[PDB]
Structure formats: structure tokens, C-alpha cells
Amino acid sequence: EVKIILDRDPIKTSFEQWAKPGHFSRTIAKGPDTTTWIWNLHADAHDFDSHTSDLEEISRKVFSAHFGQLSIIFLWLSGMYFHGARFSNYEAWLNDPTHIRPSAQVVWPIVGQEILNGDVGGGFRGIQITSGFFQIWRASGITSELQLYCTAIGALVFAGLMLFAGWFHYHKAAPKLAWFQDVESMLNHHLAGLLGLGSLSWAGHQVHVSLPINQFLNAGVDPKEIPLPHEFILNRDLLAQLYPSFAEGATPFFTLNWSKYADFLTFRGGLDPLTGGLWLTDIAHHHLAIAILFLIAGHMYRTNWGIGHGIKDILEAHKGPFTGQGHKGLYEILTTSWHAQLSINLAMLGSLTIVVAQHMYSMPPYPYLATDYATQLSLFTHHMWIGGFLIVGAAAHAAIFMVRDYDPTTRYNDLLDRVLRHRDAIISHLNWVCIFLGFHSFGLYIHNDTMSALGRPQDMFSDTAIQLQPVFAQWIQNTHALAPGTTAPGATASTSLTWGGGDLVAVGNKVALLPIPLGTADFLVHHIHAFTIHVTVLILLKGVLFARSSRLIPDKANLGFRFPCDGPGRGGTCQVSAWDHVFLGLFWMYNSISVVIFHFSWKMQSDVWGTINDQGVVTHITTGNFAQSSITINGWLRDFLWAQASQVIQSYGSSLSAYGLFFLGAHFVWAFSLMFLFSGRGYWQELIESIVWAHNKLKVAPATQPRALSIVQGRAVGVTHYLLGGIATTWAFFLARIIAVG
Amino acid sequence: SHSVKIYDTCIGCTQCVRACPTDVLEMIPWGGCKAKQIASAPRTEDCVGCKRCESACPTDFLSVRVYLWHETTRSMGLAY
Amino acid sequence: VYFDLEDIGNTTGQWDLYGSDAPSPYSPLQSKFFETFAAPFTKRGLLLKFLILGGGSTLAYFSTTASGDILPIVKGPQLPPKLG
Amino acid sequence: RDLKTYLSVAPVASTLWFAALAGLLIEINRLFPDALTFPFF
Amino acid sequence: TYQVVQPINGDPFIGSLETPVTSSPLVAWYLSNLPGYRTAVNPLLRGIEVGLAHGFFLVGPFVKAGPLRNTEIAGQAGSLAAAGLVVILSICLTIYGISSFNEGDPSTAPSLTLTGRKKQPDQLQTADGWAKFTGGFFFGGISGVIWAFFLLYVLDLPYY
Amino acid sequence: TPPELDPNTPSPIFGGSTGGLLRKAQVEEFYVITWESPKEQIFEMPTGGAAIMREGPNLLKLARKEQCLALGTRLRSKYKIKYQFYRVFPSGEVQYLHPKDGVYPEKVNPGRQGVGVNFRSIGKNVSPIEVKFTGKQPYDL
Amino acid sequence: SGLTPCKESKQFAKREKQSIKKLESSLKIYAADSAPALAINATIEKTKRRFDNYAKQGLLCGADGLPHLIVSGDQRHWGEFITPGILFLYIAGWIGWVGRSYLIAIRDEKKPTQKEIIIDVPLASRLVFRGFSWPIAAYRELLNGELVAK
Ligand code: CLA
Ligand code: CLA
Ligand code: CLA
């Protein structure tokens, strides 16, 4: 076969269908008879494979939808750059980053809100931002508000192009099903074209704009005096005085004999003692390897020249004694089901966001990011939630595939088979591990609480009594310390300062990073992590494996992916559906992530962040109480929650009172969720009966018959507010705390 | 086991019999409606109580009702 | 593998899987020593009573003690708020 | 386009309505702030 | 073409599956020789062995992790607790048996051998046998604790 | 009319599943469903994952019955097939369950006699107090 | 009325005083001719105006130093509750009356729900000003106010 560009001519464009609500569904396009109609309209709006059964049409819908998504992201980026141009103190912050608070939002003087425009420094009144954009912009060598303004226009223009493309590829030239399926092609391009050229491109701006300008900023020269980026490209003299390797052209690269380029590219590693961020000389070099690597990787798959790989070939040839003919037929499944692809992608993109958070705190990439605790606590916590959510979404679509696309008669797999043929063995074991982890992580805490309360500190699990020293993580930690020179001779300093041992970095009076200690307190929390994660996995995997059938419900697959139950029979069968497993898994992801970000916040303030003076004396924020008081639930209640929540409950009258409002505001919607979660629509519908009576009495009863929320929606509404309330509370709590104290 | 009854309000649509997962109901000759048939619960010992029958009745008020009663192995839907 | 009404047991996998059926590997006399000395506890009922009454009073007996915590001991008691 | 008019007057009618209301309320306040009572009688 | 994983005893419509951890010759040999599976032996006899092994083993955790030692001279007394747990357990067993099996009743184990050799009537699992098993479990349990404790007095072991 | 009987007929090709019979089958009951297949075909097992129908008569033993009807119902549609299922017990007696009266239950048959039908339909039942202390229940009437 | 009028309350004066000093403190960092300064001076002028009006409109104050409202019906404080309230009931009645005028216009029609999710704005604009004289709902009440079926 030969891969090519395939499209079709115009397929309609009119406001006619805008005027017709629920047009996409044949059931709902007839209009409402009850208020249920309205909710269904929004819940089935994006269910494309529920609209039609043609794979070509569904594929064309999701393709333009991605253009729509990108359009928004570009419009969203356009605003952040614009606000950094009109309503910000970036130019002020650019001179004194260590003392001036970054702010990019001014509030109108109505009703008394102007109080939120607090003293952020630089003779500026506004709201302190924790997005981190200031450190990105300084890293890109962005000097003036003009350049941020130009990027704002550039992003807005791109937003228009993205939006235009979506219309063009759904209404004008719609890609054919064969085009979407060319996966050997797409992977080649996304590997080489998007990632390879993308990383290559940024490696260029760095070694021409970022690296030159950043050196000036660090020398201490006034930002307004620093030559524009284009003065470095034109006159190579400027980029020759600093980084003299530029004296030659393509040589030595072209003549190989690498390199005299060690001058602006190196494997130094560690952290810049003056900026607190990763060496820009390393990052530029880093993107150089990433480019080439992905450019190499972009030539694995065979297309139109017989050289490369057929993915279908690779899979089929991977079969063992234990697994059967497994992997055979996976290519046809993954090229035929969107949900199958989305599940894998969510699981992986979500997992990636989580490693990003752990990598950006321990290896601070942007200049003056480490000592801005307000941002670092926000960035880590933000990615933890984003990654956390995306992972739960993988379970949902894995389940949807099982219900909707799974067909043994047409697209058998054998690997997917067998798994279903011992799903009780997998779930029963995962059940056991969770119970073991629960007792052996949380039970240790309850032990500690009881012994402490009985006045038996020596009978506790602690560093001063019965120690549970996490030696495996400690040994590794030590190994990365002895890594440079010994294992990796090219590396000058350690990978991270958490592995440094006897190295510390400070910017201003604040600590950027230092070796992070590990003790019994860290042992207990990690098993708590190991525990909470497994239970989340249990709920979701159980939902996927038993999505189709069960000893209780032989034909669950016929009931669909999202149904309330199958009645009170068989003892009761509420929340048997795969949807309800995602619903239940959502709470447990929340439970797990919440104790993760609390683990972060306390550990950093207690053992890492704090004030340092020029005598070496380090004074941490909470003063190193993590080791002796995080090993007790009462300790978490008192020394963590009670103690640190004082900032947000004492923020009224201050610039941080909005956090005080959102603190209580989020407690409200959280408790509000409990009305929906603890009750059933049977009561509410009967209550509405008495209320409907009153309206009929006064001739003001609506034709659209009011109905209580569906059983599933009641759960959807409940978990949504439980999440919004709980997460927003910690948000207000975190930001108020870290902005006031930090 | 559970208790399941039928009423002369039945119109012989036959939908519940089609809805039942454990073959509890069946249709029998009658002369109270144009369909000339009516549902019957001759095997309530095999019923589980999922009410799929009720969920499928179009009579104003259900003509087939399921009154959950004493629990048995059959009704508890146990494969063990 | 099979299915005969004749033999339901076998039809429904009622197999003594890991069963031995082998002769006793235990040396005799040893068995006989244990068979005559552990015999009183094999009657049931009586064992139940022996463990309750015996276990109960044996437990009571450790009522008696020293380095448990029977000593508020010479320590001046606080007041310690409005007093009392 | 008749039809475009039709997209409108949907729940976009709510937002156009409430945005107008919000504006009016805001201007009133900007004009008469901190009012705890009706003092004209 | 050779798969390792097979239906149980060749019957794919029955619960379990055959895997290396279930039907290996090593696993089969080991499990068939535990005191529990010696179907043809005195239940009382089988029990004592279980008690002895279990008893002996229980002393360790109680003594080492006990409130009484942990640098506190109480020491080997813990073993005494272990002697208390084998009493609790014995009670449970006695209860399980009494409730399960009736006096007149016969065995409830399975007579067919895995291979269908109907030839085999079996076990305790009767009111009479179980009582014997527990009764022996106790005797062995107490004796197990005592001998471990006995070793504790003599000493020499690296942990304690 | 007399029901069909069996049984020595072969069973379908499967590899083994964990959803299979348990002790309940051994000591309480178990079920068998049987059918005739025109071709050797592949079908989704209620308990497990995937199995191959064997051309000609086929025999399957399942626990719980509902599993029997779920599979059987699938057999009727999807592919056109005629099926029947019986209740085994442990002694060896067997019991014909479905269809049980010649024809399927959806279709009205003259042989059938009504059970549990109240001719005073409606919710014309009496208040609980009326039967208080009378073992009866209002619907039973 | 165990309170003292705000005009003659020391606590009420201490609050105006303390508030102005807080805003003036912030005034120091920004220097004179400045945007924040003008913004803060505008809040200060808005602050003085506020307290001035409360005293001017005879509102009592509590030991706390904050005004308190009398809703008993006392004539000196209708401004506090009764006057604004009647204003409310007028508007609330207006909205409800217009809303009920729409449903009755809609009820005998085609698909009535169609105009409940897609508003008939020509019809609505025709009925909105009927709420101006909504308290002549009273005269509907003398006849066709509410349904007799229930
Ligand atoms: C500008 C002219 C235009 C017109 C007249 C149409 C008309 C139509 N489109 Mg096309 N479309 C357009 C532009 C247009 N589209 C563009 C620029 C894109 C790229 C994204 C698309 C991509 C697209 C897809 C994938 C599909 C259509 C479909 C349709 C038909 C369904 C009608 C409908 O209800 O749409 C919807 C009306 C709306 C008002 C939806 C608005 C959605 C926007 C993007 C939300 C923006 C996000 C928002 C900011 C989130 C914040 C919320 C928060 C503030 C609370 C209809 C003929 C569908 C079809 O063929 O029917 C089966 C279909 O599948 N369109
Ligand atoms: C790549 C990302 C991605 C994509 C493309 C999809 C796509 C889809 N999902 Mg999946 N999902 C995802 C991630 C994703 N999901 C994640 C991360 C989770 C875990 C929570 C889920 C869990 C999930 C479930 C349980 C279900 C889906 C379903 C669907 C399908 C229809 C959904 C719909 O109509 O939209 C409708 C959109 C709405 C009704 C918007 C509701 C607003 C939300 C609930 C609250 C937003 C609040 C906001 C964040 C902040 C508050 C602001 C407020 C005050 C204004 C569609 C194929 C449904 C399905 O049946 O699949 C076929 C289905 O039931 N998804
Ligand atoms: C704080 C309240 C709370 C607690 C304690 C639990 C506990 C548990 N959940 Mg639940 N869960 C909760 C809230 C809670 N959940 C809420 C609000 C939801 C709604 C979304 C869920 C949804 C949910 C699902 C879907 C699942 C669980 C599961 C589990 C079990 C996980 C396995 C385990 O750890 O074993 C260990 C048990 C503990 C750690 C409990 C504490 C034990 C104490 C400390 C020791 C014993 C005390 C003492 C010695 C006992 C003797 C006292 C005597 C006087 C009687 C565990 C029992 C999973 C499961 O079933 O397990 C496999 C499961 O799938 N939960």
C-alpha cells in the first residue's frame, strides 16, 4: 500500500442546526417534555460515537475538536502574555526578582475589591501570581512589555488559524478514514516532526537569545541597556565576546572533532548559585540531544519506501508460552477504536504530568523559581491534580472500550482474553494487597497515636524509638551523590541538590534547595502513597475487567457503560456499572493526591525552605518538626492543619482575603455535595410533586415538566462538588499560607 | 423467594416477559383486552427482583408488580 | 473434562486435590506417645470448658503484679486550673 | 438570519440578560456606593 | 504451541486454572506432604505437628516486639503471651468444629481423587476427627511455645 | 409435550476461566444449557471471555441459570439458534426449565395456566391494617 | 434602641479614624504624584463619605461601633428596612407577574416547551412593562387569580 493525502469536498455549513437543540441525537432532537432533556443535551454533546456509527464521521469530529481546543489554548496564552504587558510589574521584577512579588492582574475599584491590589512591590498594586510566567519570560530573554505584547498578538493570530483550520477540516476538506489510520506515518511525524524539530527549534532560541541575554542579567547590567536579541544574530561580535566558540561558523560541527562548543554547552549539572535555576548552558545542550534523539526515532516505521517497520508485524511476533498468540490483532483494535487510544494516552499523559511535578521542584529549571516558594508549591500541586485526573479518565475509556468496541468474533486479541478469563484472580489479589497496605501504613499511625496518648513515646514507630528507616531509597540517594566523577565522569556536580549531601544553594536570604533527609516519617507517608494508589487502581481496574459481565450480572454489557444499576434485586445492584467505578475512583484519587500534596507542603517548609543568613545558620519555616510530628494523625491535625491554616483565617482586611473567602466558600460547596451523595432522587421527585402543585394552583406551572436529577447525574453532581469543594479549599489554604509566610 | 403479581390492567404487550433475565413470567390466554393475553408469574422462585419487568410496563400504573420478600440463594443472585 | 449424571461429584470438580492418601510418615511410638498424652484434650466440650475456666483463671492469676503500672507513685499532684 | 437570531434567545438570552443586569447594578454602586439605607424617602 | 497455562484438570467450565504455582511437581509434592493433607493419618496426629510448628514460631514476634522487653528485662515472658494466643486459637477451632460438624454426620471432604479414582473415603471433618485435630493442635501449640522459650533460656541466637 | 433429555453431547472449546462453577454446583445446584449449532462459531462466554461453538449439538454447564438465559438469549439473536436449559441438582435428577411449555414465554400458549394474577387490578388493594395479624399480605389476595 | 446614635458614638469615630490611618500608611511607599496614590486617596475619600452618610442618616451604632438596623417598624428607620423592602416586593412581584404572563401566553400553543427553552423575545418585550402595574394583579384575584381545579 502507499500512504497519501486523502480528503473530501464541502460537507455543509449553516446556522440552521444552531437553531435546533440536540440535533446530533435522534432521540433528543424532538425537543423537551421534561427537564431531563436539558441535562442529557450537555452530557451527550461530546459522545460522538453515540451520535453516528460511521468511523469516518467520528474521526472527523474529533479532529476539528482538537483544532477548537488548540484555538482556546492559543487564546489563553495570548491573554497571559497580554496581561504581562499591560497589567503587570514584570519590568520592575526584572531588576529585583528576589524581593518584588510577581503580579499580573489589576482589579477595578468597585464595591471595595481594590483591597485585593496589595503591596506586591515595584510601586505596583495587584494580585500575586503563582503561574510562574515571570521566570519563563526572563528565561526566554524577554526584556520589555513590547515583546510580551508582540507574543500576545502572535498567539491571537495563531488562535485564529487553529479555529479556521477546524472549520476547514470538517466543513471544507475532511480527512478520510484511511488517512487517520496511517499510524506508522503519524508516529513518525510526531516523533520527528513535532518533537524533534520542536526541541531543535527551542535549542536555537536558547543559544541565540536566552543564553546571551541571561548572562547580561546575571552580570547585573540594567535590562533596558541589554542589546535586543537580534543584535546577537547580526553582529556575531557580541555573541563572540561572550561564548567565544562562535568565532568559527559551522566548524567544528561540520568538521566534527567535537567540540570547542563546551563553552556554551556542558554537562555541568546541579544548580546555578546566582539564579537558583538549572544551568541554561545545560538546558540548551539538553534540547540538542532531545532533538537528534527524536529525529532518529522518527524513522522506525515503514511508509512508502519499504524501509522501516510495520507495527502490525512487530506486535504479532511477540508471543510467549504464557500468553498465547497474544499481541496479534492489537493493531486492528488500536486503529479502529478511538476510546482504546484515548485510554492509553490519558494514562500516559497523566503519568507524565506527575513526573513533571516531581522533576520541576527537585531540579528548578527557570531562573529565580526555586526561592519563589509561592510558585513552586503551586506548580507541583497543579500538575499533581492534572495528572491525577487524566489517569482516572484512562479508566473510564478503557471501560467504555470494553462495553462498546470489544468484539471477540471480529477483533480478537488473546492478551485481552485470558485476562478476562481470570479477572477474579487479579481483583481478589489487588483486594488483598490494599488491605495489607492499609494496615501496614495507616495502622502504624494509629499505633503511634495511641502510644503517644498513653505516654509511651518509646513504643512508637519513630526515629527515636522503633525505627523504620527507608534504607533502599537512602542507598539510592547516596548513589546519586557519588555519581559525578565516579559513575558519570562527565558530570561535574550532582543531578539534583537533594542528592548533594554537603552542598547548599541560596538566593537572597532564602534557601533554593538542599539535600532532603529521609527517615521513619518518610517511610510511613510513602506506604500511605503506595496504599492509596493501589486502592484507586483496584476500583478502576475492577470496573474495567467486570464492565461486560459478572456472576451477579451475566449481561451487564447490554445495560451499557453508564447506567444507575439493575434494581434492588440480588440483594441490590447499585453502582455495578463501570461509570460508577470511575465515580468511586474519583474520590480515591482525591484522597491519594491530597495526602501527596500535604506530604510535599510540610516536607518542604519543614526540611527545605526557610531563611538563611551569612553565618550559615539555616532556619526552616516550620522548623524541622516533620520528623517527630508527621508520624501521628494528631500531629497532622495540629502542627500542620491547625498551625498553618492561621494565615488564611487571618487574611480578612489583607490583600489575601479572597483566599479567606474561597476557603469558606469551598467548605460550603464540599458539604453541599453531601446532599446529593447521601440521598436519592425518589425523595426529591416527590418533594417536587408538592411544589408543582403550588404552581398549578397559581396557573404558573411550566410545560417542561420538572424532574429530579437522574440517579447517575446525582452522583455526577455530587462527586463534582465534592472535588471542587475539597480541592479549592486546599488551594485557598495553600496560596494564603505560602504567600504570607514565604 | 420474592412475590410477583399481575393485574387485569395488563394489556398483553408482553414486554416484561421479554425483559426478565431469569424467565419468571409468561403469557397466557385471556379475554380482558384486545391482545387477548395476560402475564403470569408461575416461577417466582427464580426471580431476582431487578424489576426489569416493571421498568418495561406501559400501563398507567404497573400491571406487574414485584414485592421483594424472603431471601433465597436464587434471589440473592449468588453463583457461589 | 467429562460430564456424566452418573458421577456428579466428578462432574462438578469435587476433587481432593492435594490430598496425600499416603501411609503415615510419622514414626510409631512417637505417635503413640502423643496419642496417649494429648487424649484428654480430644474430647471436645470438655476442652472448651478447660480453656474457658482454665484460660479465665490463669488470666486472673496474672492479676498479681509489680512492674505493670500500679504506681501513681510519689509525685506531687498538680492543682491545676481554677484548682481542685 | 432568522436562524442566527434563533441561536440567540437560548440560554445566551440568560447571559445577555444577566450581563446587562450586572452592568446596571455595578454602575448604580459606582454612583451610589456603600448604601445601607434608602435615604430619600 | 505449548502453553503452560491450562484449564483445571482439563475442565474449562470449572473455577480454577492450572499454573506453575498450582500444579508444579514441586508444589504438588510439598502440599501433599504437609500435615494437613495427609488424609490417611490420624487427625490428632496431623494437628500436633501444626501446633508445634506454629507455636514455636509465635514466640519470636511477641517477645521481640512486646511492650515488656524492648530493652525491658521482662524478656522471654512474651512467649507466655504466645502461649495465650494458642489458647485463644484452640478455642476458635473447637468452636469451628462444634458448629460445623455434627456427631452422627459423616465426612464432608471429597472422596474422588483428582484422577477420578472413586477409591478413597476421607478425613477428619467429622465431629470426632476435628476435636482430635484441635486437641492435638493445642498440645502441640503449648509444647511449641515451651521449647522455643526453652531455647530462649539457654540463649545463643543472634536476634535474641 | 415432553421435554428433550440428554445428555452425552459434547461441550464447546474453551481454555478455562475463573468464572466457572464452584462448591455451590457440587452441593446445591448447577445448570446446563444446550443447543444446536450450524457452524463452528465463536461466542462470548458469560462467565469468561471467548469460546468456540462446536458444530452440531452443544452442551454447556453454568452456575445460576441467569447465566443460562443470558447466553441463550444471545444465542437466539446474534445467530439464530434454538436452545434449552435444565437444572441439574446434585443427586442426578435433572429438571427441564426453559422453554418448559413447547413455545417460548413471549408467545401465548393455550396449555398455560395463570399463576399469581389478581382480577381486581389497580391499586385497589386493602390497607395493611386490614390484614394486620392475618398472615396474609395485601397483594396475595 | 439601647444603642446610641452613630453621630455621637466614640467607637464609630475610632473606626473611621483607624481605617483612614491604615490606608494612609500605604500612601507612604508610593510617594506623591502616582497612580496608586491617587487610587488610595480615592478610597480614603470614599471612606470618609461612607461614615459621613451613616451618621448623617441617623443610624444607631452598637458598642461595637458599627451601625445596627431597626426593623420593628419604628418610623425613624423605615429607610433601614421598610422602604427598601416595599421596593423589593414591587420588583419581585414585577418579575413573577411578567414570568406568569409569559407562560399563559405560551401554554395554549403548538409545542409549549419549545418557547420555554427558546424564548419568544418579541412576546417577552411585549409583556415586560405589564409588571409596572402588576399590583393590579389584585383585580385579577377578584376573579381569575388562581385555578379552581385544585
Ligand atoms: C462559523 C461558522 C460555522 C457554522 C454556521 C457551523 C455550523 C455547524 N457545524 Mg461547525 N465548526 C466551525 C464553524 C461553524 N459551524 C468551526 C470554526 C469549527 C472548528 C472547531 C467547527 C467544527 C464542527 C464539528 C466537529 C461539528 C460541527 C457541526 C456543525 C453543525 C451543527 C450545528 C451546531 O450545533 O453547532 C454548535 C453550536 C455551538 C454554539 C457550539 C459552540 C462550541 C464552542 C466551540 C464552545 C467554545 C468553548 C467555550 C469557550 C468553553 C467555555 C465555557 C465556559 C465559559 C462556561 C452546523 C451545520 C457538527 C455536525 O456536523 O453535526 C452532526 C459537528 O460534528 N462543526
Ligand atoms: C483527553 C481528555 C478527555 C476527552 C476527549 C474525553 C471525552 C469524553 N468523555 Mg471522558 N474523562 C476524562 C478525560 C476525557 N474525556 C478524565 C480525565 C475523566 C476523569 C474524571 C473522564 C471521565 C469520564 C466519564 C465518567 C464519562 C466521560 C465521557 C466522555 C465522552 C462524552 C463526554 C461529554 O459529553 O462531555 C460533556 C461535558 C460536560 C457535561 C461538562 C461538565 C462540567 C464539569 C463536570 C465540571 C467543570 C467545572 C470546572 C472544571 C470548574 C468549575 C467552573 C464552574 C463554576 C463554572 C467523551 C468521549 C462520558 C461517556 O459516556 O463516554 C462515551 C462519561 O460518562 N469521561
Ligand atoms: C475514613 C473513612 C474510611 C476508611 C477507614 C476506609 C477504609 C477502607 N476502604 Mg473506603 N471509602 C471511603 C472512606 C473510608 N474507607 C469513602 C468516603 C468512600 C466513597 C468514595 C470509600 C470508597 C471505597 C472503595 C470503592 C473501596 C474502599 C476500600 C477500603 C478498604 C481498603 C483496604 C484496607 O485498607 O484495609 C485496612 C483497613 C483499615 C486501614 C481500617 C483501619 C483499621 C484499624 C486502624 C485497625 C483495626 C482496629 C482494631 C484492631 C479492630 C478491633 C476493634 C474491636 C473492638 C472490634 C479499607 C477498609 C477498598 C476495599 O474494599 O479494600 C480492598 C475499596 O475497593 N473504600
Author numbering:
A (entry chain A): 17 to 758
B (entry chain C): 2 to 81
C (entry chain H): 53 to 136
D (entry chain J): 2 to 42
E (entry chain L): 53 to 212
F (entry chain D): 71 to 211
G (entry chain F): 80 to 229
Please, what does the article write about this entry?
Two reaction centers, photosystem II (PSII) and photosystem I (PSI), drive this electron transport chain. After an additional photon is absorbed by any of the 200 antenna pigments of PSI, its energy migrates through this large network of connected pigments and eventually oxidizes P700, a special chlorophyll pair located at the center of PSI. The electron removed from P700 by this oxidation event migrates along an internal electron transport chain and finally reduces ferredoxin (Fd), the final electron acceptor of PSI. The structure of plant PSI includes 12 core subunits bound with four light-harvesting proteins comprising the LHCI antenna complex.
Here, we report the structure of plant PSI super-complex at high resolution. In contrast to the P21 symmetry of the previous crystal, the current crystal belonged to higher symmetry space group P212121. The entire complex contains 214 prosthetic groups, including 156 chlorophylls (nine assigned as chlorophyll b), 32 carotenes, and 14 lipids, many of them located at key contact points of the complex. A new configuration for PsaH shows that this subunit binds four other core subunits. A new chlorophyll bound by PsaH was identified at the current resolution. This new chlorophyll, together with pigments bound by PsaL, probably participates in energy transfer into the core, suggesting that PsaH is not simply a ‘landing pad’ for LHCII, but is also important for energy transfer into the core during state II. However, it is clear that the plant binding site is buried deeper in the complex, this is achieved by the extension of the PsaF N-terminal and by the new position of the N-terminus of PsaH, which forms a loop mirroring the conformation of the conserved luminal PsaA loop, suggesting a direct role for PsaH in PC binding. At the current resolution, we observed new core chlorophyll bound between PsaG and Lhca1 and a newly discovered lipid. To summarize, the extremely fast and efficient energy transfer processes that typify PSI-LHCI occurs through only six pairs of pigment molecules located at three sites. In the Lhca1/4 interface, a new carotenoid site (numbered 4505 or L5) forms co-planar π systems (plane to plane distance 3.7 Å) with the ring of chlorophyll 4017, positioning it in a configuration that should provide efficient photo-protection from chlorophyll triplets.
